[PDB]
Structures are given as structure tokens and as C-alpha cells.
Amino acid sequence: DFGGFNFSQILPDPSKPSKRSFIEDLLFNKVTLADAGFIKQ
């Protein structure tokens, strides 16, 4: 009850395995990385 203001799209989403928000997921999807370097999985 934030006086009618909405923060759902920027607050964490518990459903996903990662606790990123909707917009954070959008940003991570948009930016593409290279040379992961994660035990060369």
C-alpha cells in the first residue's frame, strides 16, 4: 500500500530462481556477454 504507486516492475520477483526484477531481467537479456569463464561449462 504505497499510496497507489506501483513498484512491481522494479521490485524483486520471488518466482524466478534469480531475484532480479522485471526490468533487471530485461536488461540482462538485452546485454549479451562473451567469454563466460564459468569452469568452462
Partner: protein
């Protein structure tokens, strides 16, 4: 930790998988194990 705190140390093999060090077996006494722990860093 600090040298005067203790002479005990731990060794991290960056980007190395915990099977390669046993496979190899430079000091190698630490390769015996009993404390091997695979992390995302090595």
C-alpha cells in the same frame, strides 16, 4: 591468515577443476585431499 595468527594455508587453483589436480598426482602433498572443495573460482 596473518602469518603470526597461524602457518596454516589453503590453496586455490584458479579455473582448475578438482579432478585435474588428483589426475596430476612443485609441491603435491596438498593433492592428497580430505579438504577438496570445488568452487566457481576453481
Amino acid at each position: 591468515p596473518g602469518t603470526n595468527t597461524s602457518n596454516q594455508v589453503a590453496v586455490l587453483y584458479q579455473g582448475v577443476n578438482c579432478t585435474e589436480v588428483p589426475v596430476a598426482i612443485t609441491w603435491r602433498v596438498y593433492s592428497t585431499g580430505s579438504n577438496v572443495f570445488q568452487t566457481r573460482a576453481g
